[PDB]
Enzyme design. Structure first.
Site, PDB file in Angstrom:
ATOM      1  N   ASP A  72      31.438  43.868  49.942  1.00 17.47           N
ATOM      2  CA  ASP A  72      32.520  43.285  50.790  1.00 17.47           C
ATOM      3  C   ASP A  72      33.559  44.354  51.154  1.00 17.47           C
ATOM      4  OD1 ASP A  72      34.266  41.344  52.129  1.00 17.47           O
ATOM      5  OD2 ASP A  72      35.521  41.477  50.279  1.00 17.47           O
TER       6      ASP A  72
ATOM      7  N   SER B  46      28.693  46.210  43.475  1.00 17.24           N
ATOM      8  CA  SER B  46      29.369  44.989  43.976  1.00 17.24           C
ATOM      9  C   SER B  46      29.482  43.968  42.842  1.00 17.24           C
ATOM     10  CB  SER B  46      28.633  44.400  45.166  1.00 17.24           C
ATOM     11  OG  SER B  46      29.140  43.106  45.501  1.00 17.24           O
TER      12      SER B  46
ATOM     13  N   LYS C 104      36.028  44.967  37.945  1.00 13.06           N
ATOM     14  CA  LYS C 104      37.074  45.776  38.624  1.00 13.06           C
ATOM     15  C   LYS C 104      38.469  45.200  38.332  1.00 13.06           C
ATOM     16  CE  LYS C 104      33.584  46.192  42.163  1.00 13.06           C
ATOM     17  NZ  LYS C 104      33.138  46.463  43.550  1.00 13.06           N
TER      18      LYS C 104
ATOM     19  N   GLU D  83      34.756  52.298  48.580  1.00  7.06           N
ATOM     20  CA  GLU D  83      35.384  51.020  48.182  1.00  7.06           C
ATOM     21  C   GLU D  83      36.584  50.776  49.098  1.00  7.06           C
ATOM     22  OE1 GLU D  83      35.146  48.442  45.070  1.00  7.06           O
ATOM     23  OE2 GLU D  83      36.102  47.925  46.975  1.00  7.06           O
ATOM     24  N   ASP D  84      36.981  49.516  49.286  1.00  9.96           N
ATOM     25  CA  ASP D  84      38.066  49.108  50.219  1.00  9.96           C
ATOM     26  C   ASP D  84      39.264  48.493  49.501  1.00  9.96           C
ATOM     27  OD1 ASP D  84      36.642  46.722  49.499  1.00  9.96           O
ATOM     28  OD2 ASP D  84      37.504  45.708  51.214  1.00  9.96           O
TER      29      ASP D  84
HETATM   30  O1  LIG Z   1      31.108  34.604  44.269  1.00  6.30           O
HETATM   31  P1  LIG Z   1      30.737  36.078  44.286  1.00  6.30           P
HETATM   32  O2  LIG Z   1      30.441  36.564  45.706  1.00  6.30           O
HETATM   33  O3  LIG Z   1      29.535  36.227  43.389  1.00  6.30           O
HETATM   34  C1  LIG Z   1      32.113  37.061  43.583  1.00  6.30           C
HETATM   35  C2  LIG Z   1      33.343  37.044  44.508  1.00  6.30           C
HETATM   36  C3  LIG Z   1      34.022  38.419  44.706  1.00  6.30           C
HETATM   37  O4  LIG Z   1      33.209  39.314  45.497  1.00  6.30           O
HETATM   38  C4  LIG Z   1      33.714  40.651  45.615  1.00  6.30           C
HETATM   39  C5  LIG Z   1      32.629  41.408  46.390  1.00  6.30           C
HETATM   40  P2  LIG Z   1      32.662  43.242  46.264  1.00  6.30           P
HETATM   41  O5  LIG Z   1      33.819  43.812  47.073  1.00  6.30           O
HETATM   42  O6  LIG Z   1      32.776  43.727  44.823  1.00  6.30           O
HETATM   43  O7  LIG Z   1      31.326  43.689  46.823  1.00  6.30           O
HETATM   44  C6  LIG Z   1      35.106  40.630  46.287  1.00  6.30           C
HETATM   45  O8  LIG Z   1      35.734  41.925  46.326  1.00  6.30           O
HETATM   46  C7  LIG Z   1      36.041  39.675  45.547  1.00  6.30           C
HETATM   47  O9  LIG Z   1      37.285  39.597  46.248  1.00  6.30           O
HETATM   48  C8  LIG Z   1      35.396  38.292  45.386  1.00  6.30           C
HETATM   49  O10 LIG Z   1      36.251  37.411  44.637  1.00  6.30           O
HETATM   50 MG   LIG Z   2      35.266  45.296  48.251  1.00  8.66          MG
END
Ligand SMILES: O=P(O)(O)CC[C@H]1O[C@@H](CP(=O)(O)O)[C@H](O)[C@@H](O)[C@@H]1O
Ligand SMILES: [Mg+2]
Ligand SMILES: O=P(O)(O)CC[C@@H]1O[C@H](CP(=O)(O)O)[C@@H](O)[C@H](O)[C@H]1O
Ligand SMILES: [Mg+2]
EC number: 5.4.2.6
Lengths: 219, 219
Positions: B10, B114, B145, B169-170
């Site tokens: 994401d 992720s 994280k 990373e963002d």
């Molecule tokens: O319900 P899920 O999708 O399993 C887990 C949700 C999390 O996904 C991360 C994707 P990444 O940025 O680490 O790739 C986001 O940064 C978070 O803001 C989000 O709460």
């Molecule tokens: Mg991210």
């Protein structure tokens, strides 16, 4: 059909934030405090010099006289004014020059609704003076954003009521001040910051006469 | 020279954040709670499913059985999973696919660090699986994280030390996790959010093999 547009300066027409930041950076280093980075300077956006200076002192627990405090504030200001001598037409945000020309040629009034005490000088530097029908004096305005006072004055000075106007802002506080003046806000930035009740463009190149006409028709 | 690149999903490869938002919103709309807009969703970024729902309940000082709490969480997760069924290669952020190929053909290792429980699924849907040598299982890590655990696990999975790896990373917490793993971070976004001490690009189009190499040299 909207009669005026009230421009925020910083974050819409140009970037003054950058120079204020280097100014606070130079002063913090001049006197040995570390940790005035762009992240920390998110807390020096909006607040006045006194408040900013306190938060920089509060970092190294430096204690200063009322004499010392006044001088540091003044060396920050001298810094800021030196640095904005650089400002050129090159510093104008994408689409803005073309929006100002399109507005002027459709006989729509143009006003600056900015807290910058340097607005008139910045618009001359960027060669935009000719487009602006009025500059709201923030020294003649009783309260800063999110009070509507700056947008009302900007409107009054071009001879329109705010309700005849669109306001363009980059800040959540500015969006609020436009809404409370009675004007239609169009945001630039992210709805995460500015909210999702108002129309927002990702960047300023999306601020077109034809887009602003589209939004006015749909309020 | 760096041997692996460790990718967030994401905010780097694509947008999941927006489908989460829609799901929490459609869920809040259903149970009669107001105020779940994208501003508020910023406070759910990072947080567990469980605590995310609590923070939506705390908006209305409201309680429900520990059993129906789990059906709500489920209703929302089921909704999230329905909505990502449409993910396609069309959803891959600019420069990202070109970067994956340049990495592969330079025999450079590619791994997902992720927190998405749906990482592997999303990669298949975007037809990226072939570029990826490993996917850190977020279920198999002690802490999320900003702990390094996920960037460590991602590096190990492709047979390198974090110290031989760049992490892209963002988010601020992501950058921290990368820093504390031993890897080199390159942010995408704003220094105001991510930091002054690391290199940041404005968007994913600037993540070039040539650019990563220039950063790896200059640290
Ligand atoms: O319900 P899920 O999708 O399993 C887990 C949700 C999390 O996904 C991360 C994707 P990444 O940025 O680490 O790739 C986001 O940064 C978070 O803001 C989000 O709460
Ligand atoms: Mg991210
Ligand atoms: O020292 P000065 O420049 O006179 C006044 C200070 C700055 O003015 C800007 C003008 P604007 O955003 O309303 O255009 C604000 O956004 C900043 O956050 C504020 O710190
Ligand atoms: Mg502004």
């Amino acid at each position: 059909m909207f009669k005026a547009v009230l421009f925020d300066l910083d974050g819409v027409i140009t970037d003054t934030a950058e120079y204020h930041f280097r100014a606070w950076k130079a002063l913090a280093e001049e006197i040995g405090i570390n940790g005035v980075d762009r992240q920390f300077n998110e807390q020096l956006k909006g607040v006045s010099r006194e408040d900013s200076l306190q938060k920089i002192l509060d970092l190294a627990d430096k204690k200063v006289s009322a004499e010392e405090f006044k001088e540091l504030a003044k060396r920050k200001n001298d810094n800021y004014v030196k640095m904005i001598q650089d400002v050129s037409p090159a510093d104008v945000y994408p689409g803005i020059l073309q929006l100002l020309k399109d507005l002027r040629s459709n006989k729509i009034k143009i006003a600056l609704a900015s807290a910058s005490k340097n607005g008139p000088f910045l618009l001359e530097r960027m060669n935009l003076t000719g487009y602006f029908d009025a500059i709201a004096d923030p020294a003649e305005v009783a309260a800063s954003k999110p009070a509507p006072d700056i947008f009302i004055a900007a409107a009054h000075a071009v001879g329109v009521a705010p309700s005849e106007s669109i306001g363009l802002e980059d800040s959540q506080a500015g969006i609020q001040a436009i809404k409370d003046s009675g004007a239609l806000p169009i945001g630039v930035g992210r709805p995460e910051d500015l909210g999702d009740d108002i129309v927002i463009v990702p960047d300023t190149s999306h601020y077109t006469l034809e887009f602003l006409k589209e939004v006015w028709l749909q309020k």
